[PDB]
Design a protein around this ligand. Structure first.
Ligand SMILES: Cc1cc2nc3c(=O)[nH]c(=O)nc-3n(C[C@H](O)[C@H](O)[C@H](O)COP(=O)(O)O)c2cc1C
Ligand code: SF4
Ligand code: SF4
Ligand code: SF4
Ligand code: SF4
Ligand code: FES
Ligand code: FES
Ligand SMILES: [Mg+2]
Lengths: 42, 230, 431, 217, 62, 59
């Protein structure tokens, strides 16, 4: 079957869909590196 | 150790990391500049310091280009002269005709470099832009139509005065230097933005319209208002 | 040898047009996430050798050797993180290939990011996608979440003992932030203006760390090149112009579309085979822009026998860049089209540096006068000279790309401009 | 040409530094998640995502929202203003409920996007850059939106409507003002960038895993 | 108007070297004070310093 | 083209044309022009002193 469009998942996307997934991925992230200072102006 | 470069065929030994502009300074040549200040960070946006390397096909910005070993710097080359003429043509194409009513008249780096490394004619047949003037305090008078967007005041503000209130708002030809909000740029070192501005965009308000540089006599003395002895 | 008539068994971007499942199950049904652990265990030098032998060139503009760039970033570590930055700021007019790839092959994109990060020794990969592609970004996030859950990325990626992170950064509308250095600046939360070079992103990149900016198509074809062998990829296409390319044919054509083809298919064959040909027939063709708006246009005579590769298009005084064919037939105002392109470049200029800022505004005004004939024949040479002054004197390549269409229009349609000026001058006397 | 936008701020009762704005707890959790995506000491890299989140919460970006973002990220308000004024996807003044953006670049211009623009203008009775009296639609012209083969096209609040005709866009506007939500995508019988006449490629089943895998790999 | 009574008010002489200037002053008999030349010292400038991973020289704007 | 007694003109609106630029003083061969300026009450760049010594001018 090659006559149907399978990308219909994007028809139900709220305004926070992109950020909601980003919250879910925060558990799988590796620890971030540190530059040794809190900010360039510290 | 020191590397060897060539300026107009003359050999000169410079430290690693030295720029083309500083090598020219070593050999005695002053490359034209608008955005470069030796006490500020490098910007490389005014494009007035474009010089030609002997065999390179593209000109480089002397203010931000470290010298390589064996490079020959052609300061007075045809490509360099044409590049300077083009950059000056753009700057003066968008600049306003305010020289007689401008406090920067006889001491303007735009006028002097236009008369030295620029063309004597204009082929700009369109209309110029106009920018609303800002207000940043009683010490600095701003006529932002004369600004060439060289970002000297922003870099000076940030690095020297530690005050991050100046910046560029907008994009393209409509980019404007200012505080966005009506905050006044007040500091103990706020007249130095008047000093470092190459154009009359920032000028001394108390000194406005009083005199011209060619009339004044300069006496070298020291400052007596504190113990620094400036 | 003739190039074209690409076979589906050799096409890389399967599931284009989105006719199959784009999720993890559908991707694994096709050739995705296959022997990725074996590739990672083979390691950086082998992957770089495969890429260099395949001879892949940059698909997002200037065609620099991707193997050479990745070898440049393959230097030993010095105490700083390493990043692969994938450019999905598809702001070039006429181009949709990155959008289609992200929307229909996100697992292929993620696997390519992982392979490139392993090749470069990079700990992280930031996919900077333009903000207008919200649904594409959401699909990419869903695919990344599926990969994380399946263990294909993250800690111990593919069970190879290699830790690799993948992030997605949505950037607001900035065609200039599409550029690599401006993209690096925009990731850092800054205004988004390009840096000077040197320093190069290999030495000083995002956050001051070694980064490599690569195109979506390049990173997406990287794992397929590693799997199939690279020699096959080099075999497809011409010499030094090899591989498969996505062409976006649009404009005055019967069936505008995006299609994968060989690297040296002739332009006329591509248009007449995968796009239905020019509306009203091929003889009704006026001009074709081979790449994006940055590339110069060519007339029908040049388009009659031109090939769609870097060197062949360079010989035609134009470039390839992002392969995006724009077709204009004889029933259009070529001057108005070029003026609209120059207006686009005026709006998208970042305004940092004087040549592009001032000169692009000036050329926009000059073209706006040209479209109505309110000019003189002596101003064409002035426009040519100012375009030449802009080119090569700017910080980044947007200034160069803003002058090439003007140069092409002056070079191939000067009689049109002069006729328009004469008509305006005659109509002025009519009062 | 001129875009008719001012890059200076004049305080008004509707938009002043004392305008009430603060992130909801869910938005604060989202911000905390966003910040952890960058190395420690470089949290200024989140200015664009946090500003976008503020705009998605508030509809637009007031000066109070910019100041709140600056306070949260410990970055200068001048830097926040620079970002907001540089990037065009940030609405510095209130817009309508639906932001219609018609692409007017050359590839869309060749396929008569002016007809779409005029159909929208006549249907809503507004000019480009103006907002309807009920504050429901805001019509603007934009550059290339990334879907050029599906021209002409418009973007309405992160949704692409492609292969449009005047009747199609009028139907879209009717559905929008009727409280419904039109289905995004091409409206000319197509589903994606494939040729309208048919599939000129990829007409065979895709190969399985390891189709052309080399000896070593 | 600005009146004066000093004939040497507008008199400025140009010399190539401090030694020549001092010799001229000594042979003309006027009292003199000499100030040493203040050249600007060389400085280290790097455009890559504006984008630093862990230093304070990183700029917040361009 | 005859050169005689000097005069300062005005605009048709009545505002004086001089903007206190001192090109007069810069270019005068005989240094017969003395100009002193300060911002006017409305902020205009206008002269407060403009003297010409007709016994020093060479016309
Ligand atoms: C989607 C996209 C948009 C780009 N936009 C620009 C642009 O506006 N200006 C520019 O000078 N280069 C632009 N480039 C090219 C980049 O400077 C850089 O060459 C590219 O991102 C990485 O090179 P590659 O093709 O080898 O991967 C763009 C590249 C891509 C992929
Ligand atoms: S800043 Fe310089 S060029 Fe501009 S009006 Fe003043 S004197 Fe003339
Ligand atoms: S106001 Fe002066 S110092 Fe500041 S960017 Fe403009 S020209 Fe440069
Ligand atoms: S060429 Fe234009 S877009 Fe590029 S840095 Fe200069 S002003 Fe910015
Ligand atoms: S000072 Fe300047 S403006 Fe006034 S009269 Fe003389 S030349 Fe004219
Ligand atoms: S002085 Fe070098 S670009 Fe300005
Ligand atoms: S030209 Fe309109 S979407 Fe690209
Ligand atoms: Mg000044």
């Amino acid at each position: 079957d090659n006559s149907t469009y399978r990308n219909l998942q994007h028809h139900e996307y709220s305004t926070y869909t992109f950020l909601d997934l980003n919250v879910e991925l925060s558990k799988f992230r590796m620890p971030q590196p540190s530059s040794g200072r809190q900010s360039p102006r510290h | 150790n020191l590397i060897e470069v060539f300026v107009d065929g003359q050999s000169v030994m410079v430290e690693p990391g030295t720029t083309v502009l500083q090598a020219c300074e070593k050999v005695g040549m002053q490359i034209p500049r608008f955005c470069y200040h030796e006490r500020l960070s490098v910007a490389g946006n005014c494009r007035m310091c474009l010089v030609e390397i002997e065999k390179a096909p593209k000109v480089v910005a002397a203010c931000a280009m470290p010298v390589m070993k064996g490079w020959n710097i052609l300061t007075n080359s045809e490509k360099s002269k044409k590049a300077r003429e083009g950059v000056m043509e753009f700057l003066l194409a968008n600049h306003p005709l305010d020289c007689p009513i401008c406090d920067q008249g006889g001491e303007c780096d735009l006028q002097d470099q236009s008369m030295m490394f620029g063309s004597d004619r204009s082929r700009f047949l369109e209309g110029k832009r106009a920018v609303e003037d800002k207000n940043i305090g009683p010490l600095v008078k701003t006529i932002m139509t004369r600004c060439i967007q060289c970002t000297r005041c922003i870099r000076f503000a940030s690095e020297i005065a530690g005050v991050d209130d100046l910046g560029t708002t907008g994009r393209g030809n409509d980019m404007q230097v200012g505080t966005y909000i009506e905050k006044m740029f007040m500091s103990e070192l706020s007249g130095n933005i008047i000093d470092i501005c190459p154009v009359g965009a920032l000028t001394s308000k108390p000194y406005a319209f009083t005199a011209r540089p060619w009339e004044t006599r300069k006496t070298e003395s020291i400052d007596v208002m504190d113990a620094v002895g400036s | 040898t003739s190039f074209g008539s690409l076979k589906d068994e050799d096409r890389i971007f399967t599931n284009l047009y989105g006719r199959h499942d784009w999720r993890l199950k559908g991707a694994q049904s096709r050739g995705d996430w296959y022997k990725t652990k074996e590739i990672l265990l083979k390691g950086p030098d082998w992957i770089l050798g495969e890429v260099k032998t395949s001879g892949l060139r940059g698909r997002g503009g200037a065609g620099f050797p991707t193997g050479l760039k990745w070898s440049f970033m393959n230097k030993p570590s010095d105490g700083r993180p390493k990043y692969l930055v994938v450019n999905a700021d598809e702001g070039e007019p006429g181009t949709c290939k990155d959008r289609e790839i992200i929307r229909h092959d996100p697992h292929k994109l993620v696997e390519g990011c992982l392979v490139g990060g392993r090749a470069m020794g990079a700990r992280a990969a930031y996919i900077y996608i333009r903000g207008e592609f919200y649904n594409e970004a959401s699909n990419l996030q869903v695919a990344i979440r599926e990969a994380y859950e399946a263990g294909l990325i993250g800690k111990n990626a593919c069970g190879s003992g290699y830790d690799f992170d993948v992030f997605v950064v949505r950037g607001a509308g900035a065609y200039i932030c599409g550029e690599e250095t401006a993209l690096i600046e925009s990731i850092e939360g800054k205004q988004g203006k390009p840096r000077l070079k040197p320093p190069f992103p290999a030495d000083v990149g995002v956050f001051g760390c070694p980064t490599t900016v690569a195109n979506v198509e390049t990173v997406a074809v990287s794992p397929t090149i590693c799997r199939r062998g690279g020699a096959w990829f080099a075999s497809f296409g011409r010499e030094r112009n090899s591989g498969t390319k996505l062409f976006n044919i649009s404009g005055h054509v019967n069936h505008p579309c995006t299609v994968e083809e060989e690297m040296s298919v002739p332009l006329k064959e591509l248009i007449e085979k995968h796009a239905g040909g020019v509306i009203g027939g091929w003889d009704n063709l006026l001009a074709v822009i081979p790449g994006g708006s940055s590339t110069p246009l060519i007339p029908k005579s040049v388009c009659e026998t031109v090939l769609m590769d870097f060197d062949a298009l360079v010989q035609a005084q134009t470039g390839l860049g992002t392969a995006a064919v724009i077709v204009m037939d004889r029933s259009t105002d070529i001057v108005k089209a070029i003026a609209r392109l120059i207006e686009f470049y005026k709006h998208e200029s970042c305004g940092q540096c004087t040549p592009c800022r001032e000169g692009v505004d000036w050329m926009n005004k000059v073209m706006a006068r040209f479209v109505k004939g309110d000019a003189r024949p002596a101003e064409i040479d002035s426009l040519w000279e100012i375009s030449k002054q802009i080119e090569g004197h700017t910080i980044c390549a947007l200034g160069d790309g803003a002058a090439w269409p003007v140069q092409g229009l002056i070079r191939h349609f000067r009689p049109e401009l002069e006729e328009r000026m004469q008509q305006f001058a005659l109509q002025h006397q009519a009062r | 040409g001129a875009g008719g936008a001012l890059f200076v701020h004049r305080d008004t009762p509707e938009n002043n530094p004392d305008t009430p704005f603060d992130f909801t707890p869910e938005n604060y959790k989202r911000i905390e998640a966003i910040v952890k995506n960058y190395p420690e000491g470089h949290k200024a890299a989140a200015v664009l995502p946090v500003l976008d989140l503020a705009q998605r919460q508030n509809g637009w970006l007031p000066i109070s929202a910019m100041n709140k973002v600056a306070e949260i990220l410990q970055v200068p308000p001048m830097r926040v203003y620079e970002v907001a004024t540089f990037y065009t996807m940030y609405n510095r003044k209130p817009v309508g409920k639906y932001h219609i953006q018609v692409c007017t670049t050359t590839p869309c211009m060749l396929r008569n996007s002016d007809s779409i623009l005029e159909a929208i203008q006549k249907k809503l009775g507004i000019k480009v850059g103006e907002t309807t009296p009920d504050k429901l639609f805001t019509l603007i012209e934009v550059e290339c939106l990334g879907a050029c083969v599906n021209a002409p096209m418009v973007q309405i609040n992160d949704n692409y409507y492609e292969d449009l005709t005047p009747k199609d866009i009028e139907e879209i506007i009717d559905e929008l003002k009727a409280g419904k939500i039109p289905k995004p995508g091409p409206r000319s019988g197509r589903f994606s960038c494939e040729p309208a006449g048919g599939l000129t490629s990829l007409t065979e089943p895709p190969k399985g895993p390891g189709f052309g895998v080399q000896a070593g790999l | 108007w600005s009146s004066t009574a000093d004939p040497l008010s507008n008199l400025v002489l140009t010399f190539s070297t401090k030694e020549d200037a001092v010799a001229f002053a000594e042979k003309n008999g006027w009292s003199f004070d000499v100030e040493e030349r203040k050249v600007p010292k060389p400085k280290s400038k790097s455009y890559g310093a504006n984008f630093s991973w862990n230093k304070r020289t990183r700029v917040s704007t361009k | 083209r005859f050169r005689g007694e000097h005069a300062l003109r005005r605009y048709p609106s009545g505002e004086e044309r001089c903007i206190a630029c001192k090109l007069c003083e810069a270019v005068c061969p005989a240094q017969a022009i003395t100009i002193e300026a300060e911002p006017r009450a409305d902020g205009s760049r206008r002269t407060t002193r403009y003297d010409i010594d007709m016994t020093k001018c060479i016309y």
